[PDB]
RNA sequence: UCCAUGCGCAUGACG
RNA sequence: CGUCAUGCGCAUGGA
């Protein structure tokens, strides 16, 4: 079978006669069969040939991967040759070369492959290199611009070809390169306020890639889009506590002299407490540091009120204080400032809360205009918000609300696995899960973070609601935006244009520009290297002091610090442990003798290590030089020695 | 299956 | 350059 769509055909011709182009499409076409039909025809070629035909398939993330050698590639081809899932997750017995030697065609992830060719490079002994295959196919090749996966892989076969040409000229033989084919649903536009800059855009991408052309249907147009149904476009839009927070703040700001400079709740405002935080910081000072801090909670409360229930800020500083309260009874087993700043907050806090159940509310708009979506509805919603406590919040609002409970439509949380700003990450397990509930119409409606944007197997919905995020199917679409749509149709207009703009380009004339963009991204490159090299130079062993940040004094030394798994440092020389605080609540997490946060005590090899974070300490070097705060280990250059086991055996 | 950690990347907003 | 929010990948250790 493998019989292959007409608008498919057309567009995928160039590419049998070892043409590196790439093929843009819209979603829903199937351009993954497309490239399926691709891959069969290059290996039959190369079979004829009776050379070796590889083929190693990139992804930016790996359900994709899952998705392809699960339901696209295995089915038409697993009986014609080898074909391997592979990921960097997938505990895979046998080393990524052998693979390449043992599988005829790969599913993979960019990264693994960018490793193995690092290691090539490295003492690792372990090689490959984009010569060894004979095709090599990208999806959502827009991510090749800015030092991202594939554009990293990329650039080494530009440098090769470079070379390949010199040595054309100055040699008769010269070494080999692969076909590059590159898919996307559209090529995308950056920062492009100019049909000019959009084409300069895209021909960097195509340099990136080294493309040949770009190719989109027209001819048969009609068809495809016959056969796609595509939704269309719409737009749809609908106290006291903050004053009483806001009195505080102020009250704040009299008792720290600290002039905002900006108005409330904006992130200016964030940013001048975070630039104050790190002077104080640098200064050894109190109600500088620690009262700057405060404020950016107050705000943090105070942007979080304006869109949503004061209650969420209310739970917001009532966890923010509590926690602080622990802190502050560990290290007991305050001062003028916590004394302050806490009783300042507990003496308004029911006062506070009193005034939170009074709804005197953008999320009540929203409440509203979703009841009368669900009238319409006889199933299917995502909503979108721009951060995780957002979807969290919107979750139990809505669980705890009477009305959504009398519709009788469901409703889940949905975000992403990475461990940041502290909140709970979802598993991959658990998104998978959750999706496919939502598919089966276990959950009615899907709250989302961007995870569903994109990626995630999310069709055939009623309706797509958005709650302030920047960015349907089944012929019905009821899109919805309460609070750019315009800008972004303009956006696509551009590049639309700028497309056929390159299209119908001279083949010299672009050429000469994609070269000129490749020795540029080379010229980059090779910057990037001189500049980060020259910053690890001193290496020193112990040049330095580990400080608390709140209480400015002397926690550690340059060289008590030893590094485990070459990833993270510790002291021992237990005169440091009779300082630090342990505490737990539900391996456990170490805190200061005046309630700072410090890291926490992981375990390797059997020893006990109070692991730390640099984050939450100031340097201060031996030279007297200023204080510094780094948020990680790297931006330091000196070099802190390896554990060794054999001491403290004790 | 879960936990914790390090590293790199892109996106949007903001300065 | 910094900030914040969001998403992604890789590599670790333990359970
Ligand atoms: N030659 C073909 N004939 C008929 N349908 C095809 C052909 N090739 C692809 N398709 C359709 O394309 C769909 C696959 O789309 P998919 O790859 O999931 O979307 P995207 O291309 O955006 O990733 C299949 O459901 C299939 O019906
Ligand atoms: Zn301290």
Not at 56 to 67: G, S
Not at 169 to 195: E, F, R, Y
Not at 460 to 487: F, K, M, P, Q, W
Not at 620 to 634: A, I, R
Request: some cysteine; overall charge positive; aromatic content about 8%.
């Amino acid at each position: 079978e493998l019989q292959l769509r007409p608008y498919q055909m057309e567009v995928a011709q160039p590419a049998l006669d070892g043409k590196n182009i790439i093929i843009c499409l819209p979603t829903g076409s199937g351009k993954t069969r497309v490239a399926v039909y691709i891959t069969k025809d290059h290996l039959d070629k190369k079979k004829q040939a009776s050379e070796s035909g590889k083929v190693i398939v990139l992804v930016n993330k790996v359900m994709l991967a899952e998705q392809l050698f699960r339901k696209e590639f295995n089915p038409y081809l697993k009986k014609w040759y080898r074909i391997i899932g592979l990921s960097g997750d997938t505990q895979l017995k046998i080393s990524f070369p052998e693979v390449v030697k043992s599988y005829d065609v790969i599913i993979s992830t960019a990264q693994i492959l960018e490793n193995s060719l690092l290691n090539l490079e490295s003492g690792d002994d372990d090689g490959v290199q984009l010569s060894d295959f004979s095709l090599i196919i990208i999806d959502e090749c827009h991510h090749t611009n800015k030092e991202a996966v594939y554009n990293n892989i990329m650039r080494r076969y530009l440098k090769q070809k470079l070379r390949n040409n010199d040595l054309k000229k100055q040699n008769k033989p010269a070494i080999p390169l692969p076909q590059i084919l590159g898919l996307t649903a559209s090529p995308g536009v950056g920062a492009a306020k100019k049909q000019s800059e959009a084409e300069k855009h895209i021909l960097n991408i195509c340099a990136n890639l080294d493309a040949f052309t770009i190719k989109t249907v027209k001819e048969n147009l009609g068809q495809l889009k016959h056969q796609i149904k595509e939704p269309c476009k719409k737009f749809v839009i609908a106290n006291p506590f903050k004053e009483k927070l806001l009195e505080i703040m102020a009250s704040i700001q009299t008792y720290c002299q600290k002039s905002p400079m900006s108005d409330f709740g904006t992130q200016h405002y964030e940013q001048w407490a975070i630039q104050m935080e790190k002077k104080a910081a640098k200064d050894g000072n109190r109600k500088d540091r620690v009262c700057a801090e405060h404020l950016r909670k107050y705000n943090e409360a105070l942007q979080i009120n304006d869109t949503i229930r004061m209650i969420d800020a209310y739970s917001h500083l009532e966890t923010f204080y509590t926690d602080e309260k622990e802190k502050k009874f560990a290290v007991l087993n305050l001062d003028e400032t916590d004394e302050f700043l806490m009783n300042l907050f507990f003496d308004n806090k029911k006062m506070l809360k009193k005034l939170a159940e009074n709804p005197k509310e953008k999320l009540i708009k929203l409440r509203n205009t979703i009841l009368e979506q669900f009238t319409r509805s006889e199933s299917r919603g995502i909503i979108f918000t721009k951060t995780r406590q957002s979807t969290y919040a919107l979750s139990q609002w809505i669980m705890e609300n009477a009305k959504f409970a009398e519709v009788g439509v469901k409703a889940h949380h949905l975000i992403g696995a990475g461990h940041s700003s502290e909140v709970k990450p979802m598993t991959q397990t658990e998104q998978k899960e959750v999706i496919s509930k939502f598919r089966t119409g276990e959950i009615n409606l899907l709250i989302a973070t961007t995870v569903a944007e994109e990626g995630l197997d999310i069709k055939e919905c009623n309706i797509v609601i958005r709650y302030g995020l920047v960015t349907a199917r089944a012929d019905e679409s009821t899109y919805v935006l309460v609070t750019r749509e315009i800008v972004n149709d303009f956006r696509e207009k551009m590049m639309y244009k700028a497309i056929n703009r390159v299209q119908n380009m001279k083949p010299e004339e672009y050429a000469h520009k994609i070269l000129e963009l490749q020795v540029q991204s080379i010229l980059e490159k090779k910057m990037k290297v001189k500049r980060s090299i020259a910053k690890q130079y001193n290496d020193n062993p112990s040049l330095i002091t580990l400080l608390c940040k709140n209480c400015s004094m002397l926690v550690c030394s340059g060289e008590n610090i030893h590094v485990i798994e070459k990833m993270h440092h510790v002291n021992m020389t237990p005169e440091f442990k009779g300082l630090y605080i342990v505490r737990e609540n539900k391996n456990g997490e170490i805190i200061c003798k005046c309630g700072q946060a410090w890291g926490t005590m992981m375990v390797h090899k059997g020893l006990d290590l109070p692991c730390l974070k640099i984050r939450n300490f100031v340097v201060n070097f031996k030279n007297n030089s200023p204080k510094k705060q780094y948020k990680k280990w790297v931006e330091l250059p000196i070099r802190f020695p390896d554990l060794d086991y054999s001491e403290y055996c004790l």
